[PDB]
Design a protein around this nucleic acid. Sequence first.
RNA 1: GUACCGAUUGAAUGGCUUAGUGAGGCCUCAGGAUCUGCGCGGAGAAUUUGGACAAACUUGGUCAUUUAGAGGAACUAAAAGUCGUAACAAGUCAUUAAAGAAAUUUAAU
RNA 2: AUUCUUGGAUUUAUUGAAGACUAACUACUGCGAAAGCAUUUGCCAAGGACGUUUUCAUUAAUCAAGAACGAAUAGGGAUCGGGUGGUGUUUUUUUAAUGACCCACU
Lengths: 109, 562, 214
Amino acid sequence: SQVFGVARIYASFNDTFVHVTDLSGKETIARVTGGMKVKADRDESSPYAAMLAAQDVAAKCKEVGITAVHVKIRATGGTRTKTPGPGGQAALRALARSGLRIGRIEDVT
Amino acid sequence: QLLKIFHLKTGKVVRSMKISSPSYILDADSTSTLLAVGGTDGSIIVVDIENGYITHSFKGHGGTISSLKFYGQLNSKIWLLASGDTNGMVKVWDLVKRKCLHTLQEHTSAVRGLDIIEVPDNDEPSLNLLSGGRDDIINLWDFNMKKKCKLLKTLPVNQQVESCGFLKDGDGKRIIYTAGGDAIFQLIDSESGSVLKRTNKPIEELFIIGVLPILSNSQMFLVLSDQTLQLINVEEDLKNDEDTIQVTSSIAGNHGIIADMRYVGPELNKLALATNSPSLRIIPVPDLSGPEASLPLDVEIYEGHEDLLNSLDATEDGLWIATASKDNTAIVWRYNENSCKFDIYAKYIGHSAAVTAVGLPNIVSKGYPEFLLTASNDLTIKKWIIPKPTASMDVQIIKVSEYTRHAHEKDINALSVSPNDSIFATASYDKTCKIWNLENGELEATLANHKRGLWDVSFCQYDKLLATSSGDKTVKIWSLDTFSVMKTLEGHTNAVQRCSFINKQKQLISCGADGLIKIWDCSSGECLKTLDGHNNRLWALSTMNDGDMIVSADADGVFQFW
Amino acid sequence: VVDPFTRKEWFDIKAPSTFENRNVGKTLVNKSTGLKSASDALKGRVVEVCLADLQGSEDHSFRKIKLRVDEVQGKNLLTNFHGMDFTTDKLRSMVRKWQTLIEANVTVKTSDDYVLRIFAIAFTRKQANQVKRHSYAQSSHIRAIRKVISEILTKEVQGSTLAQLTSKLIPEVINKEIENATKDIFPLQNIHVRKVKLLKQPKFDVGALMALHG
RNA sequence: GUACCGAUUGAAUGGCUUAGUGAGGCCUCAGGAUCUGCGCGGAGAAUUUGGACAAACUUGGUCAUUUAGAGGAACUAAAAGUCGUAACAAGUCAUUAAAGAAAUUUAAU
RNA sequence: AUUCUUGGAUUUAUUGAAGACUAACUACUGCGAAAGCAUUUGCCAAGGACGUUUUCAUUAAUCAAGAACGAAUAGGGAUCGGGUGGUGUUUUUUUAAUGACCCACU
C-alpha cells in the first residue's frame, strides 16, 4: 500500500545523526543533521534544534515520493555511554507530527 | 500544501487552496483563462473558478501526477484526457461525471506526461498524440472516442524524454521541439518518425517547458537552463534560411556566489565574473535593468572549461581575458568575439596542479598584454611568453621544464603585477609575500611578518606603497624599498580577504569577512567611511577610475553601488 | 545543481516461494546507460527483515531474515537467503539472573555445497515446587548436553538444502528435537538457534534457483 | 614623476662593414632491401667521384634614440612630518430554495 | 581553543587485517600455599574430599639457620562437594532405564 524505507536515527552525544535510506540501506536520501541548523556549538544535540532538522528531513522525503518509513534508533554503544540522546525523541516526534507513517521500529545499539 | 490565487499585479489573496493533505506539485491556467486545477502525487483533482467555485469532487484513481495539459471541451489535467501514473497507462474519460469510458494499458515504463501536448481536432484524420516524460520512449497515439486506441510508430532512437511538443496547425510535417533530460533537445518529424536535427548545446538536464503562443515554424524559441535563458534559431535545418544547428543568443542571469570579478571594457564598461558554473556571464555593470538586453556586442556566454572557475583577470583594453579553472589549463578569451579556433586564443597545458590564480602584465598596446603570467597550485608560477609572433595565438611551451620559479611549500592565493614590468609580489599561505623580478625569475624580496596565510596583495599605481591582506584582522602596508613596514591598519572585526587601491590613489578599500565593506584613506591611515548593505561574506572588489561607483561581491549575487 | 532523484531508477523487491507474500519493498538503483548500466554493476545489496512482516502471524516477532540479491529481469529481482538474525531486546531479556547459559556452534557442508556455521543457544528452566532459588547445572551435564545437541545438528543438515532447511527452521521443529533428547538429563527453557550465516556458496546456479519461482 | 647636463656607445635597433661560418635542390662513374609477365624489363631505399647555382648565420667598431644611468641642478607632488608662532569659530444580517456529501454558486422577502 | 574535510570529512553497506577479551549470567560461589584462576573442544599428568572389612606400623607434631615463589562452648539456618536410606515424585501411551527433583541422615 505504501513505499517504505528505514530512517535509522543515530542519537549520540553532542550531536544526533539521521539518514533515511532505502530498505537495502546502501542508498541514502536527504541526510541533513541537527548541528547544521544551529551555530553555537553547544546546542548541536538540543531537542529544539532536533525538531527543526527533522522537519527539513521530512520535507525532502515526501518531495521525492517516499511516503512511509521505519526507523532503527542507535546510541553510541560499544565502550561508550550506551544511552540514547535527548533529541532522539525529538527527531522521532517531529517527523511523526509531519505526517509520515510509522511501524515496528527497533534498536541497533 | 500551498496554491494561492491572485488577481492583477498587486498580488492580494483571492483564495488559497490548502485543503488536500498531499502537497501540490504544479499549477497551471486554463484555456478559459479563469479556471485552474493543480496536480499532486495523490491524484486529487478539483476544478476551481476564482469567483469562487471549487467543483464536483473527482476521485477515481490514485497514482502520481507530474504533467498536465488542458483542452477546450475537456478542461482538466491528465486525469481526464489521459492518466499520469507511476507505471504508465491511458484512461479515457468524459466531461460528464466519474464514470470510466475506456482504459488503455500499453506501457512497461513509468510515464506521467501522457497528454503533455494537445491534439486539436480529437478526430485525427492526419493528426497524432504524443506522450513521454519518464519512460524515455515516445509512442504515436491515436484518438478514439468510442473505440480502443492504436499505436502508429514508436521512437526508440532517443535515450531520455521529459516533455514533448506538437505543431499548432497539427500536420507534424513542420518543426517539433522535443526536450529531453539527457542535455539533448531535438527537432523531429511525426509523420515519418525521423529526427530533423539534434542540438547538443547544454551539459545540464533540460527542464520542463510550456508553450509559446506562436504558430507553426516559429519566430524565436526559448530554451530553459539553470539561471539563464537562450534564444535559438528556428530552422536548425534547411527549412527557411539556414541549417547546421547553432545558438542565436544566450542571455545570462546571475549565480549566487561570486569568486572573482574583473572589469572588461576599456572604458570600464563590461564586467565578467567567475562562478561555480563553467560559463562566462558579461551582464551586470552596463545592465542596470534585469536580464541582459543592452550589451554593446552580441549577447553570448562563453564555455571552454570542464570545471568551476576560480578567478579571472584582464588588462586595460580587455582584448585578452584570461580565466582560471580546476581543469589544469589556461584559457584566454577575446572581446569582440572573433578568433581562429572557437573564441579562445589558446589553451595552456603543462600545469601539474590546478590553476587558481592568473594575471596579465601592465598595458602598453600589445606585447605585455599578449603575454600571460599565471599561478598554479603546484608550488610554482608560470610566465607564458613567446615574443617573436603575437603571443597568445597558439599553444605556448616556454616554462614547464626548469624555468618555473619554486621557493614555496604552501599554496599561492593571488598574484599582483607592478605598474612597471620590473617586479611583482605574490601572496601565499606560508605567511609571507615574495617579490620576484619578471625578467629573470630571481627572489627580489621576502616579506614574512604575519600570523596567518595571505590572500591578496595589491600594488599602488604610483608604486611607492604596498598593501597586503592577512588573517590577524589587520592590513599591512610596506614600503617601496621594503626595508620597513609603512603602516599597519587595524580595526576589522574579522579576517580581511581583499584590499585594493583606487585609480586616483587616495583610498585603500577593504573587503573581508566582516559582512561589511570599509573604505580607509592612504593619507592618514584612518577610517574614511564604513559601508553597510550586506549580511554575507565578501570575496572580490573592482572600482572604476572615478571613485564613486564601487561594486562588491556577496554570497547571494547582490551587487551594490555608491 | 543536480537533483539526482529525477534520474534515479524506481524499483521493487520480489521474494521466493516457501513463504507468504512475495512482494517486500522498494529500493532505487540508477539510470541504465552504456558504460555502467544499473543491472550488471552492483547486485550485492542486502535486505535484513523480520519474517513476521513476511508471514503476517505475530508468533514470530523475532527471527529476522537477511537476503541476498541474485538475478533481475526488468523491475523483477529475485533474492536468496543470506542469514538468520535475532532481536536485541530478547537476548537482553532472556538471560535471567541465577541460571545457566549454554551456547553451541558447528560448521557443516550441505547437499549443494553451501557451507554454513549454525549457532544454538540454550537456557535452563526451573520446575514446580522447587525450594532453592538458583537451580544451576552441574558442569558435567553441560559437557554432555553440548555434545548431545551436536549430533542432532548434523543429522538434520546435509540433506535437502534451504528450500527444506529454512522450512524446518520456521516452526522450530529442530528445537523440539533438542528437547526430546535433553529431557533425560535436565529439561530446559526457550532454546533457539538465534543465528545462521553463509560463507562458502560454490556457484550461481540460476537454473536450480528458478525452482522456487512461479 | 616630468623637462635639462653628463660618463658608461653597457641592452635594443638602424647605416656601413673586417673576419669567421654556411642550408638546399641538379647531372654523371659506381651501388642494389625489392617487381603483375615466355633469355629479362618497368620501378626502386642507403652509400659515393667530379662539376655548376646558392640564400644564409655570428662578432666587433663608428653615430643617433631609449632603457639602466654614477655624478649635477630645478619644477611638481606631500595642502604632508615634527616643533614653535598667530587669531577666530564652536556645544449582503436572518429564514429558506436550487447545484454540489462538505465548502461554495445562484435565487427569494 | 586544538583536529579533520569537497582527492567527499561524518555516516551508510560490503570485505580483509591487527591486537585484545570472554558483557548479561558472575554469587559475600568454586579452586590454588599465596601470587592468582571465567569462549568451545581435545590431550597430558596432578590434587583433595567422599567411599573402603585394601596396605606399612609411631615411621610423628611444631620450628632459629637454609630453600622456592611474590613486589624484590554448641546449637539454628543457608549453601558447595560426596555418600546412604525412600509406606517418593517426574521425564516414561517405549520395553526398560540414566538424570533431575524432594524428605531424612552423615
